[PDB]
Structures are given as structure tokens and as C-alpha cells.
Design a protein around this motif. Sequence first.
Motif, PDB file in Angstrom:
ATOM      1  N   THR A 254       0.824  -1.176   0.000  1.00  0.00           N
ATOM      2  CA  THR A 254       0.000   0.000   0.000  1.00  0.00           C
ATOM      3  C   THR A 254       0.860   1.227   0.000  1.00  0.00           C
TER       4      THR A 254
ATOM      5  N   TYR B 251       5.015   6.860   6.026  1.00  0.00           N
ATOM      6  CA  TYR B 251       4.079   5.924   6.597  1.00  0.00           C
ATOM      7  C   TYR B 251       4.697   5.149   7.700  1.00  0.00           C
TER       8      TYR B 251
ATOM      9  N   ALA C 200       0.075   5.248  -0.910  1.00  0.00           N
ATOM     10  CA  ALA C 200      -0.970   5.909  -0.179  1.00  0.00           C
ATOM     11  C   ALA C 200      -1.008   5.291   1.170  1.00  0.00           C
ATOM     12  N   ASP C 201      -1.899   5.785   2.055  1.00  0.00           N
ATOM     13  CA  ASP C 201      -2.039   5.314   3.411  1.00  0.00           C
ATOM     14  C   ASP C 201      -3.280   4.472   3.515  1.00  0.00           C
ATOM     15  N   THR C 202      -4.043   4.336   2.414  1.00  0.00           N
ATOM     16  CA  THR C 202      -5.236   3.543   2.342  1.00  0.00           C
ATOM     17  C   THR C 202      -5.059   2.710   1.127  1.00  0.00           C
ATOM     18  N   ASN C 203      -5.766   1.568   1.047  1.00  0.00           N
ATOM     19  CA  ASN C 203      -5.676   0.620  -0.033  1.00  0.00           C
ATOM     20  C   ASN C 203      -6.146   1.168  -1.347  1.00  0.00           C
TER      21      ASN C 203
END
Lengths: 241, 108, 118, 195, 256
Positions: free
Chosen positions: A50, D85, E195-198
Motif C-alpha cells: 500500500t 508511513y 498511499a495510506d489507504t488501499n
Amino acid sequence: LTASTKYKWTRTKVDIAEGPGTMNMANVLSTTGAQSVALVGERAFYDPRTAGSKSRFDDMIKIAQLFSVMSDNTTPSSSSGIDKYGYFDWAATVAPQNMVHRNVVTLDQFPNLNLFMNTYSYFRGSLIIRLSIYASTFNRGRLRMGFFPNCTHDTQLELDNAIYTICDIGSDNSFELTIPYSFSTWMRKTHGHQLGLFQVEVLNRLTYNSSSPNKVHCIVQGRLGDDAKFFCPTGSLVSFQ
Amino acid sequence: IQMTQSPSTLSASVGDRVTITCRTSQSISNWLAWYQQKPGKAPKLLIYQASTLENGVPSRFTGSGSGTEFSLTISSLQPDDFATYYCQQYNNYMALTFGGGTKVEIKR
Amino acid sequence: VQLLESGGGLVQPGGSLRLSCAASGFTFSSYAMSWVRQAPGKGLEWVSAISGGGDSRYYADSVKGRFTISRDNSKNTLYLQMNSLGAEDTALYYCAKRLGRVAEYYFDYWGQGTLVTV
Amino acid sequence: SISPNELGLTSAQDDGPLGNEKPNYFLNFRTMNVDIFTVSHTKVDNIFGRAWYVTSHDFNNGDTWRQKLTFPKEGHGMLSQFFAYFTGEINIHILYMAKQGFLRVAHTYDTEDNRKTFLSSNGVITIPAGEQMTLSVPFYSNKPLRTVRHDSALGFLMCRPSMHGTTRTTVEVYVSLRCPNFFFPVPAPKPTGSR
Amino acid sequence: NEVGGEIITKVADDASNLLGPNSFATTAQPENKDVVQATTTVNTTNLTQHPSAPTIPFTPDFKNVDNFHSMAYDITTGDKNPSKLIRLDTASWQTSYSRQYEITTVELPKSFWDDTRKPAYGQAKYFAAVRCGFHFQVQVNVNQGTAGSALVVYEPKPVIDSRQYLEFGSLTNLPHVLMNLAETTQADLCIPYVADTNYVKTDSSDLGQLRVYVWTPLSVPTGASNEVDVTVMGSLLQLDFQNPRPYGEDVEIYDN
RNA sequence: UGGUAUU
């Protein structure tokens, strides 16, 4: 004969060492063992795809090994490069053996290594300075960037005894200068004595014709080598925004 | 956050379809509610959860919308639908706020 | 179900009165209560809410660190200890009750309000 | 053989995939690599295993304290600012300073500040007055990655004391991460001041 | 009765002479049997409880491929046409722009299907969520005898948000191509889904942007070009639209 | 099975 009928069975008695219930949160092996507030004490399956990666980043020294512009500015040096800004310009009116840049290189001038000088106390490792000359294809000059390690004498010095590189502008326009780890101890301070005196002298002036600029821009940017190490975490000297 | 209503004064005749809109800064997932307040009286809950009707509320009232654009609609005004209409919201932060109010009055 | 606030009055700036709100007609302790105020001829600012057990109190930023909503489930009375009042605290203070089956705060029944003049 | 690229003649545009570098050679020196400790201090697991002060809070009443945790911009923790992240467990270290009472710590990544009303179901650890406790929080977040720059990157911390009277009690929080998975390097932040 | 017919037949074969039976009978289940049909396509079930037999033409051929190849492209064209190389942006680069001036900025998910002219626009309207990997080619052409360089950085969504607090010197920590204009005229740069979301929302800039900054200003000589175009071409390495939505509806697929 | 801590 007698077995556990000889002594009254009792549960094991142990002595408790100094400072029970002291929290050691300076050692990584003391904090990996902490009791979990997870429901079953379980762990999650992480997703690295992701973030568009196949694995996590596992060593911080790989970011110290990325180039970062030595004291960035939005305008080229106006002191004739006799200032910290690693964004000077090389005019064609600069005669040989005149510096186009000269500063006493500190470790906090590079923004990547500004965070490791505020995190780690000591470091050891070579410094790779890269000097990218942004000249056109018709320009033809020759600079000689040298580095006197641990030298803080900020004045024009001849670079014949320095650790220099002679740069010839052509089609490869980035010239690395590796300066080995040089200090009197096994690891120097990150916020202590300055790394040395970097200077970029003109060796053969910058030539030009009517179809090319008479003044090219240069960008100094450095990183640490592949033998770089940072030791002993310590407090910051400046906060970050 | 702050949510602003669209008309601050509506003037309409008895039998008209009026629409008061409420628009929030960031999404609240249907967590709005509409009040009717007659002057000199305490507010009465009309429409909770953006469109559900509280018991004993006429079927004239019909809230709609979700996210950042809610709207109360009175299908036909009656003479007791002239009041001020506030939109209170609920959000994660528990920063319950109300709209500016929308006076609905007689069109003479 | 009927809420009846009491304790309104006139206080000088930097005063400290405490409104009460004796409630009846429902099981008091199973609902959250709030104090939403209405400054003369405008809005409906929500001052503060207290959960059913009284184990969670929320305040609006405007009145935060001044007011202190409490409740005493035994005698079904909700309190609003207001300290260091300003001239922005001149409002009619209604004691709203939280709605039934919902996972959000919406005000069901309301009191008739008690004026506070500063 | 040694090519002129390994003597430091390169083009910055001919840097291929990111983080691909090679060492240069001079006649009398090359990269050394000397270990002066038995473990590395720049290994990601190791560096963030050490804790860093987050916040302190005075409890003058029994009310729950919601504190949004995030990566710091000072201390040694700020090396996380080089990443975008994060996925992993975080350790929270709470120093409860009280004369009597207990402090009920709980951690959630849920943004709804109304799930702390019944605090027990978020997983409570009761810390006796005057004690301290390190609890390891699992990655119970809806997002598979937390953004480092977000103000509630590391979730929220709820502490509700079992007060004795109205006698105030204090609590210092320190966070540290056990086995953090950091992804995607991002630019260094500029020091405070600057502009 | 399924033996009803076969009792009449037996009786008639026991009464038969040399002229054979005078009767015959058969019993069977009807030709309009009680059955339920169910058909499924993509995001669609069709439960019929009184179906008819389905019919097809005389000797039909359901291979849809043209044997004479009157459109002589691969049949996968039109399914791989929403991911071709399109011109994402174009700007100009004056010779007066300084050393950290932001030339272009391409809002990454939404700029691939932001306008009708982009061939992925049609497919993007029917889906709310996307996951995709990009390939960018940023092209800057200058004449020989003009210096200056540019920095083509891919900043993801967290970097867009906090850009004002970052150092420009370490902007090359991101997937970049520092391009000297005297040499190259094109910087290729493959970027995966970050990204931080799928999945991100289709109509958003939530995969960041692809900015193009001035690394060193143009050093033009007299009587040469002053403006220099900076075009950004993009192509999707993979495209994976997923959540069906009403045409061009703003459907939020995130939690607040 | 004193396996009379458990087995």
C-alpha cells in the motif's frame, strides 16, 4: 528413604534485585518485552504494498547516504561564494586561482545530516561532496574542488596539499569528492569540530561564445559514505517544524 | 468546524415547498438533526439522523442529504410552520454545534 | 417527561452561579443531559454535555475551563456550575435531554430555560 | 575493473533507481567500515526502541484525558520524520504520580471521542498510584498505514484516574515503537525558525 | 402417473392381432417444466422463476473476433486504452524564475481523467475507487548553448500537506529525476501506488502530485529562447477501478 | 504407597 516427606514443600523463593518497578526505556530489549494491551496479545499482518514497497525500511544509515544540498538558497551566492551556501555561480570573469566557493563545512549544513546531528552524538564515516556544474554544451572550464580536513582557517589557501578533484565540464557534470574519515578519535562529534575547509578554485576559466552563457550555476550537495555510522542517541539542539 | 445554513430568512405562503439547507465543513455521516423553535418556546426535535422523523412530527417535514449537504424540506406550509429552524450536528470530536437558524415567515 | 431548570438570575461579571435542572418522567441516569444556551435573539450554542453515568463530560471551546457540568443521579438533578462569567454568558439556558436509540447526540426534550444576565 | 564512474565522474540524471549509490576510490583510500560497538545504533528497530517524552497532564478531576499521540519533532524520535508511513506496535510508558488511586490507561486509534465513555472495553491497564507501566499497543487501526505527519498518527491515549478526593495527580507519557515498519522516505523537515 | 401410458400400451399389445396394436400411449413430464433460472453478469443477478427456453439463430457463431481484421489492432485495445500515454500538463519556464520556483504540479489520480480528451475519463466516471501505478515522462527541450536544470519530484499525499515545512535540499529523498537540460530532454519516472489507504477516491489528489521545480535557473545567452515548455506525459502502468457508483457522483470511500 | 503440594 524420605522424599518430599522430609521437608515441607514450599514454592520457590527468589530475591528481587535493586529498584523493582523501575522503567528502563533506554534499552530496546527492555521495551520489546512490554505487556500487550492487545486482546489476545496478537500481532497484525502489515501491508507494505500500500506504500508501494516490498519491504520496510530497516536501517537509518541509508538516508544519511542520500545527497542533500549543502545550505540551499533561492539565489546564487552574492559574497562570491565566500559563504556557506552551496549554490554559488561561476562567472567567466573569475581568473584562475580565485575561489568561486569556500566555506568551513559543518555537518548541519546538509539537511539530511542536520537530523542526525540532532539525534546522534557521534559519527564516523567518509563524506562524499558532489559538485554538479550546470553548464551548457559549449562551455568549457575546469574547477578544482579541494578539501582540507579539520581545517577551519577560512581564507584562500592553495589546494596543492588538499584532497582535491579536478573537474572538467563536459557531458558528465557531477564530480564527486570522497573525503575519508579523518579525525583523532574513533568517532567524532556531530556537533563539535567542523569537518574541514571546502574550496572550489578556478583552474582554467569558463570559456563561452555568443551562443552560450558566460556564467553557469553550481550546486554542492553531499552525503556520507557507505562506511558511515552514527552512534549514541542524544537530545536535539533545535526542534523541527 | 462550523456549518452555515443557506437562507437565513425564508418568506413563503401557506402551501409552498420551502427548503432550508445546512452545509458542514467536513463530512458527518448522516449525523444531523433539525429543530423547530417557535418564538418564546423551547426547541422541538423534528428530524434526527438527517432524515428520520421524531414521533408526532407531521409528514410535511422530510430531511435529506448526507456528508456535507443536508436539507430540510416542508412539502406544504401550514400556519404553525413559521418558526426558526436550526440544524444541530454530531461529529466525532463531540463538538456539537447548531446552525444560525432560518426564520420562516409569512409572505404577505 | 419534563425538565425544569432553576438557578438563573443576575450576577456581576466574573460571577459564579450554578443552575440546577430537576428532571422527572423518565429514568434519569440512563440518558446523557446537556446544557444548550440561547443568547438573546440568536443561535443555540451548545455549552456542555454529561453522559448518563456522569463518567464523561464534554464542553464547547467557548465555555471550556470555566463551566463544570455535574449530575447527581440520586435526586435526578443536573448542575451547571458556571464560574468567571462574561457578558457573552448572557443567555437563556435550556437543559436538553439526549435522544433514545441512536449512537449520536440529538436533543429529545428540552426545558423552558432560565435566564442568566451578566 | 575500476571505471571513471568509480573515480567520481557521474551525471546526476544517470542516477537510476533511488538509493542506489556506489563508493569511489582514490589511490590511497577507500571505504573502511569499522564497528566500534557490537550492535548498530542506526538499525530502525533499535533506534526507536528508546522512548521519548510526549506530554504531561495534571488530573484535577476524574475526567478522561484524550491525548492524540504523534511522532515528535525533537529528541531522537524525529528520525521518523524521514518517512511518510508507519505500521507497527507502539509502547506507551506512563508514569503515574499520585498519592492514592489508580490510573486507567487505554489506547485506541478510533477517532470517535465517545467510545471512551465506557473506557473498559478499549483494554484498560490500571497503574497503582506512584507506579509506572509500559504497555505495548497493537496496530488496531482501520488505515493499514498511519501518516507520520498527522496529529493523531499514533492514535489516542485515554487515561481516566480513580481519584481520591480532588487531590491532583500528574502523569508523564513517553512513546517508543517496537519493531516499526517505516515506508517511503520523504524530505527532511527544516529546523524551527527559518522563515 | 408415469406408468399410466405404459398400461394402455400393454393392454393394446395383449389385444393386438396381425395388424399390431390399435392404440399407443405415453406419459411424461411436461415440456414446460417448473424450473428457476438464474443469470449473473458483472454486479448483476437476474432470478427468473418462469423462464422460457433461450433461442439462438440458425447455426450461429458467437466468436466475435473478425477474421478479416478490419480494425487491425489487438482486441485488448479499448480495455487498455484507458491507460495510454496522455499529455497531463504543460507549462512555461521563464528565464527569470529563481531556484525553487514550482513550474508544474500534476494532481496524480484525477489528472489522468480530468477532462474528456483523456481516454480514461469515461471509465473513471463509473467507479469511485482506484488503485494505480504511474509512468511519467517529463520533457523539457532547450537548444544547445542554454544551461539550467529541473527537478522532477514525485511527492505523495503526506508531502503535499506538509511541503511548506520541508527542506528543498533534501527534496531528492523522494523518487526524483534531477535533469540537466544541456544533456537530457526527458526524465522517465515510474511510480507505484503509494498511499495510506488501499484505494484512493477517483476524483482526488490523494496520490500526491508530480511537481517540477527549477533546480538551477535557465542561463540563456542573448538572442536565444527565454521560455521553455515543460510537458508532463503520464501513462498508467496498471489501473484498477473498483467501487461502482452513479455517473460522476462524489462517493466518499474514507472514514473521517 | 508420606503420591501427606501437584503427577
